[PDB]
Write an enzyme that holds these catalytic residues in place. Structure first.
Site, mmCIF file in Angstrom:
data_model
loop_
_atom_site.group_PDB
_atom_site.id
_atom_site.type_symbol
_atom_site.label_atom_id
_atom_site.label_comp_id
_atom_site.label_asym_id
_atom_site.label_seq_id
_atom_site.Cartn_x
_atom_site.Cartn_y
_atom_site.Cartn_z
ATOM 1 N N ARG A 74 -13.472 -15.729 -34.909
ATOM 2 C CA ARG A 74 -12.994 -16.867 -35.687
ATOM 3 C C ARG A 74 -11.476 -16.943 -35.678
ATOM 4 N NH1 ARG A 74 -12.215 -16.895 -40.989
ATOM 5 N NH2 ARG A 74 -14.121 -18.006 -41.548
ATOM 6 N N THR A 83 -11.345 -12.967 -42.258
ATOM 7 C CA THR A 83 -10.753 -14.303 -42.508
ATOM 8 C C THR A 83 -9.341 -14.168 -43.051
ATOM 9 N N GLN A 84 -8.354 -14.322 -42.170
ATOM 10 C CA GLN A 84 -6.967 -14.314 -42.617
ATOM 11 C C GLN A 84 -6.646 -15.572 -43.405
ATOM 12 O OE1 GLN A 84 -5.368 -10.701 -42.134
ATOM 13 N NE2 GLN A 84 -4.099 -12.457 -42.720
ATOM 14 N N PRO A 120 -9.520 -9.171 -44.147
ATOM 15 C CA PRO A 120 -10.289 -9.266 -45.384
ATOM 16 C C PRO A 120 -11.401 -10.287 -45.308
ATOM 17 C CG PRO A 120 -8.265 -10.423 -45.631
ATOM 18 C CD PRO A 120 -8.168 -9.711 -44.326
ATOM 19 N N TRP A 158 -12.688 -13.059 -47.404
ATOM 20 C CA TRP A 158 -11.994 -13.840 -48.413
ATOM 21 C C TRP A 158 -12.850 -14.152 -49.628
ATOM 22 C CZ3 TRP A 158 -6.983 -14.450 -47.065
ATOM 23 C CH2 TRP A 158 -6.174 -15.173 -47.941
#
Lengths: 235, 202, 229, 237, 222, 213, 239, 200, 214
Positions: free
Chosen positions: B91, I1-2, I105, I107
């Site tokens: 992603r 997920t940054q 992380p 999120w």
């Protein structure tokens, strides 16, 4: 022979390799340890091959720590590696916990190396055979004076008095005759040297033995030639 | 770009524009954004064309291998799950918005939307791309349960035409696909075939 | 994981027995012949099949490594096929590095190094083949023979497989350096005819030539026209 | 002759002689007993001395507050396996903040012990365990072999001459379930006594008792602390 | 630069310029931007020239292996797939913008490949700085199912537009014609611009330049 | 963009005596200007003679107390004895320094009885520098709390006063008063006050209410 | 000396190690599985070697996943290992493809894992045969049996162990296809009781499991009420 | 912080303040900056107290291992080299460390200044920390190799005192140490308040 | 997920006498766009446990499949042991902390609620690994808006009934629909008790909007 590998069991279940190592230790030199309330004593026969050999070079008794010293019998080259790990283990323990590693912990740690020998998928660099040596770890800790015998099997056990090497059988018989818990360090040293005198082929003198004691007050102390001469003159 | 899919009784309909833009420049004005993952399963691609083509081919590979192993036709949920796993693993790397569509025996026509981030949801109708914004209202209004194949095709065409008119990134021609038990019938609308909505005049 | 110990080892005499056994295997292989001529070099071998059911064109003993290099074997076909695949890859590595076609000598050296690698490496038998490699470089023809050991020699003409001693005597009788490629083809076909043990035909032999143009295996019609003599 | 050496070699009779030879190791060791009731589980051991001067070579080990073991066979493989089990229980408490279930622990043990016996250049862990613990489901007793197959038991004994203990336990099994702790340990001590030579007798020096319960965390009662339990034992012929 | 390609009735025409620029300075009047990949496939390159030529060399190697293993001609989709997979693995850092075209058993095929890994199969494409002018020419005068000559004229005109309207492109026009029957590589197909004659002679006589030292070392020949 | 750290508040105290060690902390947990809960004790019992308090990022606090409990179990299994307070402290220093380049943003305090029987308090930086003290405060209000303790317990900047040894009752009353004041003038503390005292008999826990925000 | 490794064909073309592994399962107590219209039923003659061992020890029935169950013979350790393999294969399938693994694909995968071991010398063949059973509304009941050799075949009824032959006869005279699980449980109980030898095996504890529509796709052990009813019927029919 | 070390005829003298700060907040006024690595050599802290303490403790275990293996006590130069080679691997990774390794050996008194930057230098005077600049003046004006032990004690005290007086991030109590051929000793732990009463 | 892409807003939770109830709006928002209006941000882990999450919905799906396989295996063993809600809380806390320590992380912000051994559990997990238990919980802007109401009610009344808790939750959800922009009227209620997990369908908040006419 190469017919059977290192890791295999006899029909009895004895694991030929460590069995052979145990009987190999019987070639090793004699060594005796005694445990007392006053302290622990260690004594060996240096087994000088020829007079040209300097006796001081032979170090069958060593210092793992100030409070611990071990004697060895058998293949000394393997013992060197074992005491190396025992030393770094004690010092890592000190680094981490700011306290003195006890004798049971030390001999437990070094005994973990034994029986790690393996050929298939052991490691990129690893042992291909058991360590053919027996040890007599002795020292003092919070519990008190202690002594431990570590065989190639890895079986560490506490023992008040023990004799390893070639004359282990007769030495242990004599030790059973002699020993009593009330005995002091001086009497213990005298008895140990008497038994070494019995078993040793050569006449006992200050050159051909190595002696050390650990007491609660002092550290590992190896008896020098003058002290040994005094003691054997007493005996 | 603008992609759109809607589920009808016994199948689905797919629709997409035919324009790919690099900035304000149209590199390809006749591109086919409908990629068949399998005989009865299709994919509509939004976002990075490179990323979408790569994941599409990889999923096609994995799904063909799975199907030939099982000796049964693949499932649209399976295809969408493969897309989801890929897009969620990567992603951060790839920007891809997918809407998978197909038919299977046990569940019939199915539409799944795999937006950016690697989530997966079944939807009766789903839209994606830059132009989908401009038609959310139209689809929310004029959608009806139980539409036919022809009705859904006209619906999709009208929506894509509106998005093409308003959005710059989407335009060109409309590619349509209707997937069902029989097979896939693809048609392309160009020129007058696009539904024309009169622009306001003073 | 695989075995990490060599299967080939020196005998008390000093001979690596596995290599000479592989040499005996290739000696049992089919006849294969090569003749270097003035303007080119020819490779020929019998392609004899167990029955008519076998499709001759399905498989080719004569394989081209590059536009200008081709080789033939005697012995084990699968070993030959891995070797030719690796050789093609090596030649193309050379081409990527240098942007020129590989020389025949360097190709021979590399494939022989491979055949050595399987000699000394662990848990692998040697290759069961002996190869003949041909090429045209610097306006000169070349013919080389690589043994299972990994030892390469250069020949004006030679034979392999069954009856190779007799075929080589035949070549030594009939070979002339001044020969053109057509007469070379005739001599090679005659050599194979010496030990064919059957009625020769366009199908049951495979022929390939190398010249200034490049390597190419002759068509059935071409070999038939040559067989007319 | 040829089949015995390798662990990856089936005999023509369908038997791997190597694992049998390893089981012969646990069949030559200091005997130990495992026992359980509705509310407690007990481990009893004959600590075995090399010589009169020597200590008796501990048999019972802490693995967790709710689990303990008793070994018979190669002490090296034993303490290796105990380290593995301690790490399993610790990572369980770290991740889930729960005590590990005993059944899952022995499943892990069985897997780890099975991996050697199927591969070349490796040996079976020539050790047999009596695992005792308390979980939500209550007391448990588990037995292991060098053969990775494990068992769930009402009671069990391993080591030399353990068959005498086994027959005594099979005889007196019915009463153990409702027994209080002292009666339970006394039964176990009698069963251990059966294994001993008739000349030898139980003493504080040569007995080690391990106990776990609903409230009681696992506890090894050493030589000085076993005298209350064995004081009640009557006699044997 | 400027590269272009177009499919006609029975084949495919590729065209390109020859100017190569380092910054805002010409380094090669006559650079060959058309690269052999196979006897039936060719590629024109733009962007980072080293990336293009290395990539084309690698793919031509792999295709040579594939082809001589199969015993049959390579296909265009094969090259496109190899290329896009490599370029996607390198995530656009290798700036190879390629126009790949060839004729195979199924027919003439033309692919335009962008550096990030994308791809479009099209009847006509253009790439480089002059791509927009070339596209204008094509969108004006392209027809489906043209003949070879009018296709060649179209490509020449598109490249000429890129030349006479872009700074990056210039100096010549190259054409590679490919069909099932034949392949024709026309390196100077046309010379729209040429250097004017030097009016004044600046030839320097011997001795115009001083020399502090000199060393001559002969070479043995034969 | 992503910040792995956040200040969850918290305040901790530790006092030592001749035969006792007092450890106390607030129970409030708060990210930003919002309270998360009013009952989250920062003080955990490691063993019979030791109590640890942790303040700062609650995730790091949790992992740290978990690791410490694990390594205490490991030490006991290996050496057949419970860890002393100084050993716990040294191990904790090594642990904290292991991740020096991605630290635990946590201020810890150890409070326990030493082998001799005296009270002991070891005060840690986030990176693992540890110093024995007779008293220490940690957390948001450490700056508020330490001066008063330096004045009363340490008798600093006080002229001609008896250097009386501290007693249990006076210590308890003192910690109650200082946490009252810190609740009065600090936002991060104030939910409640758990006083976990350790002595020879064992550990007793007492609780007293503080003014809610 | 051709039987010391599985990387060695005999001159007649047989790998003797896998045959010896098959002998190993042949000397193990019988297990049977029968497919019917509504699902699958398993039954095991679990010998109780000692009175000390509790009920449920050495359980030869496993749930490799919620929708599929396992019944084994031979070395129980290798059986447990293969159960772990089946479980992780099913989990990976669910994670990747998003639905419960088909039993055919699962049997193929574990069969490849088994067959991998007979090729090389470093590892011995597995000493356990085993049956898999599941039910899906779309797939239906499915029973597959794997041998040590790696071969996997579907069965309407299958048996593994000492009494494979006699069990197969008794299963052959059953007409499973019309029958349902509620009768099939009693039938498998009867079969186990007849094939059991009181002389050779002192005692056994019947282990039964089923999966089908009645469980709405959930392999589980039999409730004791039905299990006792089936055992009573089996002992009565045994006479 | 501030530290001080110099060589004179009767061994080596080490002095340091006892203050630890985080920003402008004095966390501790009783920290032992000098570290007794072993009975025969010792070290000091400046910079990251955690860094210094940890790495010097690691040095201590290495030194004991060397002693056990070679049966001879390690030299100061070797110890400093060990420490420098260890910290150099972590160069640029944020370590803030500065220390003075002090001891006796066969050559004589030993004093070496190691740093996270990588410097390793012997000398007869060194001062490390925020107050080192203020310390150098007093030490340089008062230092001689021919110097009585009490004079050395006094000038060390006065140097640390003035460094504390001028520098904000140093203070507390001097922790004076004296290395002699037999081993180190702690001579005094005077407080700067008492010293202010004395010197004024 | 940054950086999160598709997000869910606040999740509420409160424990009552004999069980726990949590609530969440059925919405997934793509940057101020109510893109997905029918998604369950509530999960049924086991009979005694239910889970609700905010933040990146894809990460929540990942946790769903992972935790589902975990409880599935626990069921497969058939050993009479089941993971407790507090055990799942601990496992999840470690997972989020690890993903944070790798700077990758998840999120999400989670709310675990469960009932076992006659005790009701309610715990929080943040993307950074912050974890705690409380009688009531709220995520997102719910922490600022709803949690005051729950806290006042719980402080005056320590223990609640199922109906009282449900009315309270619906009231807080009404407040969130009023004063939060990433919210939607449709919401699910999930309640756990001795019976087990029972998740209700989409429900309405029944706004008034009488204020406008003023």
């Amino acid at each position: 022979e190469y017919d059977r590998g290192v890791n295999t069991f006899s029909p009895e279940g004895r694991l030929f390799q460590v069995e052979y190592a145990i009987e190999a230790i019987k070639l090793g030199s004699t060594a005796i340890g005694i445990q007392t309330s006053e302290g622990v004593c260690l004594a060996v026969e240096k087994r000088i091959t020829s007079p040209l050999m300097e006796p001081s070079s032979i170090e069958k008794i060593v210092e793992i720590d100030a409070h611990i010293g071990c004697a060895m019998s058998g293949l000394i080259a393997d013992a060197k590696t074992l005491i190396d790990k025992a030393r770094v283990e004690t010092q890592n323990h000190w680094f981490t916990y700011n306290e003195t590693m006890t004798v049971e912990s030390v001999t437990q740690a070094v005994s973990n190396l034994a029986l790690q020998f393996g050929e298939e998928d052991a490691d990129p660099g690893a042992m291909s055979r058991p360590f053919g040596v027996a040890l007599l770890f002795g020292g003092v800790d919070e519990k008190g004076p202690q002594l431990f015998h570590m065989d190639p099997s890895g079986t560490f056990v506490q023992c008040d008095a023990r004799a390893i090497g070639s004359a282990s059988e007769g030495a242990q018989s004599s030790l059973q005759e002699v020993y009593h818990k009330s005995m002091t360090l001086k009497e213990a040293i005298k008895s140990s040297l008497i038994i070494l005198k019995q078993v040793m082929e050569e006449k006992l003198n200050a050159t051909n033995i190595e002696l050390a004691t650990v007491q609660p007050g002092q550290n590992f102390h190896m008896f020098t030639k003058e002290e040994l001469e005094e003691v054997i003159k007493d005996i | 770009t603008t992609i759109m899919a809607v589920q009808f009784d016994g199948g689905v309909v797919l629709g997409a524009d035919s324009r790919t833009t690099t900035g304000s420049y149209i590199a390809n004005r006749v591109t086919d954004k409908l990629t068949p993952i399998h005989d009865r399963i299709f994919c509509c691609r939004s976002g990075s064309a490179a990323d979408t083509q790569a994941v599409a081919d990889a999923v096609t590979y994995q799904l063909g291998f799975h199907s030939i192993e099982l000796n049964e036709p693949p499932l649209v949920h399976t295809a969408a799950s493969l897309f989801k796993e890929m897009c969620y693993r990567y992603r951060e790397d790839l920007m891809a918005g997918i809407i998978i569509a197909g038919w299977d025996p046990q569940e019939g026509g199915q539409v799944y939307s795999v937006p950016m981030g690697g989530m997966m949801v079944r939807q009766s109708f789903a839209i994606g791309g830059s132009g989908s914004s401009y038609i959310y209202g139209y689809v929310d209004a004029t959608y009806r349960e139980g539409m036919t194949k022809e009705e859904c095709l006209q619906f999709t065409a009208n929506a894509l035409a509106l998005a093409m008119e308003r959005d710059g990134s989407s335009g060109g021609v409309i590619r349509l696909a209707a997937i069902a038990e029989s097979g896939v019938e693809r048609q392309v609308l160009l020129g007058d075939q696009i539904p024309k909505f009169a622009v306001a005049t003073l | 994981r695989g075995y990490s110990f060599s299967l080939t080892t020196f005998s008390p005499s000093g001979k690596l027995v596995q290599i000479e056994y592989a040499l005996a295997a290739v000696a049992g292989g089919a006849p294969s012949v090569g003749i270097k001529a003035a303007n080119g070099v020819v490779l020929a071998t019998e392609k004899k099949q167990k029955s008519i059911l076998y499709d001759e064109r399905s498989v080719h003993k004569v394989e081209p490594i590059t536009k200008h290099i081709g080789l033939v074997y005697s012995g084990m076909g699968p070993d030959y096929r891995v070797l030719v695949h690796r050789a093609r890859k090596l030649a193309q590595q050379y081409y990527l590095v240098y942007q020129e076609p590989i020389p025949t000598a360097q190709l021979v050296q590399r494939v022989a190094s491979v055949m050595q690698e399987y000699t000394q490496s662990g848990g692998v038998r040697p290759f069961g083949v002996s190869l003949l490699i041909c090429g045209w470089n610097e306006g000169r023809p070349y013919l080389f023979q690589s043994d299972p050991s990994g030892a390469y020699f250069a020949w004006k003409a030679t034979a392999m497989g069954k009856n190779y001693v007799n075929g080589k005597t035949f070549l030594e009788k009939r070979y002339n350096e001044d020969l053109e490629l057509e007469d070379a083809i005739h001599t090679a076909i005659l050599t194979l005819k010496e030990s064919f043990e059957g009625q020769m035909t366009e199908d049951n032999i495979e022929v390939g030539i190398c010249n200034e143009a490049g390597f190419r295996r002759l068509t059935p019609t071409e070999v038939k026209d040559y067989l007319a003599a | 002759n040829q089949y015995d050496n390798d662990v990856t070699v089936w005999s023509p009779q369908g038997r791997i002689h190597q694992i049998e030879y390893a089981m012969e190791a646990v069949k030559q060791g200091s005997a130990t007993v495992g026992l359980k009731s509705k509310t407690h589980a007990v481990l009893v051991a004959l600590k075995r001395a090399q010589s009169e001067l020597a200590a008796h070579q501990k048999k019972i080990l802490h693995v967790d507050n709710h689990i303990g073991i008793s070994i018979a066979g190669l002490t090296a493989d034993a303490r290796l396996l105990c380290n593995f089990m301690r790490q399993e229980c610790l990572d369980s408490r770290f991740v889930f903040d729960r005590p590990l279930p005993v059944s899952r622990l022995v499943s892990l043990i069985g897997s780890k012990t099975q991996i050697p016996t199927q591969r070349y250049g490796r040996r079976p862990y020539g050790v047999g365990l009596l695992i005792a613990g308390y979980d939500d489901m209550g007391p448990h007793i588990f037995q292991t072999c060098p053969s990775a197959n494990y068992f769930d038991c009402r009671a069990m004994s391993i080591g030399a001459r353990s068959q005498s203990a086994r027959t005594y336990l099979e005889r007196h099994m019915s009463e153990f379930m409702e027994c209080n702790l002292n009666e339970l340990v006394k039964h176990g001590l009698r069963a251990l006594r059966e294994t001993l030579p008739a000349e030898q007798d139980l003493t504080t020096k040569n007995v080690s008792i391990g106990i776990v319960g609903k409230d009681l965390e696992f506890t090894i009662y050493d030589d000085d602390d076993v005298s209350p339990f064995l004081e009640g034992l009557e006699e044997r012929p | 630069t400027t590269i272009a390609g177009v499919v006609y009735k029975d084949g495919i025409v590729l065209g390109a310029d020859t100017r190569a620029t380092e910054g805002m300075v010409v380094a090669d009047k006559n650079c060959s931007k058309i690269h052999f990949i196979s006897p039936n496939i060719y590629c024109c390159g733009a962007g980072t020239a080293a990336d293009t030529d290395m990539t084309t060399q690698l793919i031509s190697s792999n295709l040579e292996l594939h082809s001589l293993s199969t015993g049959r001609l390579p296909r265009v989709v094969t090259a496109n797939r190899m290329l896009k997979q490599m370029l996607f693995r390198y995530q656009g850092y290798i700036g190879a913008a390629l126009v790949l075209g060839g004729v195979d058993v199924t027919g003439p095929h033309l692919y335009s490949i962008y550096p990030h890994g994308s791809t479009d199969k099209l009847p006509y494409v253009t790439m480089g700085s002059g791509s927009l002018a070339a596209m204008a020419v094509f969108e004006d005068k392209f027809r489906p199912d043209m003949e070879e000559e009018e296709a060649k004229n179209l490509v020449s005109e598109a490249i000429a537009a890129g030349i006479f309207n872009d700074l990056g492109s210039g100096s010549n026009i190259d054409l590679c014609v490919i069909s099932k029957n034949k392949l024709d590589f026309l390196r100077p197909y046309t010379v729209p611009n040429k250097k004017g004659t030097r009016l004044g002679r600046y030839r320097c006589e011997k001795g115009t330049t001083a020399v502090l030292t000199e060393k001559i070392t002969p070479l043995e020949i034969e | 963009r992503f910040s792995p750290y956040v200040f969850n508040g918290g305040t901790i105290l530790a006092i030592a005596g001749e035969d006792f060690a007092i450890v106390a902390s607030d129970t409030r947990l708060s990210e930003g200007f919002s309270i998360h809960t009013r009952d989250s004790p920062k003080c955990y019992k490691l063993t019979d003679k030791t109590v640890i308090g942790c303040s700062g990022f609650h995730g790091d606090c949790l992992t740290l107390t978990k690791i410490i409990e694990a390594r205490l179990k490991m030490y006991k299994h290996s050496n057949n004895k419970a860890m002393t307070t100084g050993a716990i402290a040294a191990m904790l220093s090594t642990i904290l320094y292991s991740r020096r380049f991605f630290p635990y943003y946590v201020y810890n305090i150890i409070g326990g009885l030493d082998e001799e029987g005296k009270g002991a308090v070891y005060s840690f930086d986030p990176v693992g520098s540890y110093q024995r003290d007779s008293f220490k405060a940690g957390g948001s209000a450490s700056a508020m709390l330490q001066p008063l303790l330096d004045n009363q317990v340490g008798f600093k900047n006080m002229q001609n006063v008896e250097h009386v040894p501290l007693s249990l009752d006076r210590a308890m009353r003192l910690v109650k008063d200082v946490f009252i004041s810190a609740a009065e003038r600090d936002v991060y503390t104030g939910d409640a006050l758990r006083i976990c005292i350790v002595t020879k008999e064992g550990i007793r826990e007492e609780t007293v209410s503080l003014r809610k925000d | 000396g051709y039987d010391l490794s599985a990387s060695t064909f005999s001159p007649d073309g047989r790998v003797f190690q896998v045959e010896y592994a098959m002998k190993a399962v042949e000397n193990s107590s019988t297990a049977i599985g029968i497919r019917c219209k509504d699902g699958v039923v398993f039954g095991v003659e679990k010998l109780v070697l000692s009175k000390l061992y509790e009920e449920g020890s050495n359980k030869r029935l496993f749930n490799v996943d919620r929708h599929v169950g396992m019944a084994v013979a031979g070395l129980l350790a290798d059986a447990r290992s293969l159960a772990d393999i089946a479980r992780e294969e099913a989990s990976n399938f669910r994670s990747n493809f998003g639905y419960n693994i088909p039993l055919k694909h699962l049997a193929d995968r574990v069969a490849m894992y088994v067959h991998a071991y007979t090729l090389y010398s470093a590892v011995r063949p597995f000493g356990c045969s085993f049956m898999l059973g599941s039910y899906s509304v779309n797939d239906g009941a499915q029973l597959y049996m794997i041998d040590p050799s790696g071969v996997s075949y579907g069965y309407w009824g299958c048996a593994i162990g000492k009494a494979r032959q006699a069990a197969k006869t008794e299963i052959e005279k059953l007409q499973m296809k019309e029958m349902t699980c509620r009768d099939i449980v009693k039938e498998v109980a009867k079969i186990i009781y007849i094939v059991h030898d009181e002389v050779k095996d002192k005692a056994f504890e019947l282990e039964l499991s089923w999966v089908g529509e009645l469980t709405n796709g959930r392999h589980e052990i039999v409730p004791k009420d039905i299990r006792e009813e089936a055992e009573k019927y089996a002992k009565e029919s045994l006479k | 912080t501030t530290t001080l070390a110099f060589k004179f005829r009767h061994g080596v003298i080490v002095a340091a303040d006892s203050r630890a700060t985080a920003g402008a907040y004095i966390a501790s006024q009783t920290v032992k900056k000098v570290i007794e690595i072993n009975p025969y050599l010792l070290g000091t802290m400046a910079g990251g107290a955690a860094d210094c303490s940890f790495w010097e403790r690691l040095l201590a275990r290495q030194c004991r291992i060397y002693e056990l293996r070679n049966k001879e006590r390690i030299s100061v130069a070797a110890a400093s080299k060990l420490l420098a080679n260890m910290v150099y691997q972590y160069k640029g990774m944020g370590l803030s460390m500065g220390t003075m390794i002090c001891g006796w050996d066969k050559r004589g008194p030993g004093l070496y200044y190691v740093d996270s930057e990588g410097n390793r230098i012997s000398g007869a005077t060194f001062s490390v920390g925020s107050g080192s600049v203020y310390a150098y003046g007093v030490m340089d004006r008062g230092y001689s190799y021919d110097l009585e032990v009490e004079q050395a004690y006094d000038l060390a005290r006065r140097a640390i005192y003035q460094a504390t007086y001028r520098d904000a991030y140093s203070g507390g109590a001097v922790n004076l140490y004296h290395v002699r051929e037999d081993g180190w000793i702690r001579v005094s732990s005077d407080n700067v308040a008492d010293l202010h009463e004395k010197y004024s | 997920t940054q950086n999160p892409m598709v997000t869910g807003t606040s999740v509420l939770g409160v424990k009552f006498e004999g069980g726990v109830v949590i609530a969440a709006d059925m919405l997934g928002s793509y940057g101020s766009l109510a893109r997905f209006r029918n998604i369950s941000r509530i999960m049924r882990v086991n009979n005694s446990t239910m889970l609700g999450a905010s933040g990146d919905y894809a990460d929540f799906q990942y946790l769903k499949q992972v935790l589902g396989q975990m409880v599935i295996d626990e069921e497969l063993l058939g050993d009479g042991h089941s993971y407790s809600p507090r055990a799942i809380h601990s496992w999840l806390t470690r997972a989020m902390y690890s993903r944070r320590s790798k700077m990758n992380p998840l999120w999400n912000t989670m709310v675990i609620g469960g009932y076992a051994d006659g005790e009701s559990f309610l715990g929080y997990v943040d993307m950074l690994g912050v974890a705690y238990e409380a009688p009531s919980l709220a995520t997102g802007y719910g922490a600022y808006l709803a949690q005051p109401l729950l806290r006042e009610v719980l402080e005056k009344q320590p223990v609640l009934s199922q109906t009282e808790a449900r009315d309270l939750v619906e009231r807080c959800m009404r407040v969130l629909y009023y004063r939060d922009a990433r919210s939607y009227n449709r919401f699910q209620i999930a309640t756990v008790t001795e019976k087990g997990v029972e998740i209700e369908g989409p429900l309405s908040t029944e706004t008034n909007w009488d204020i406008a006419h003023m």
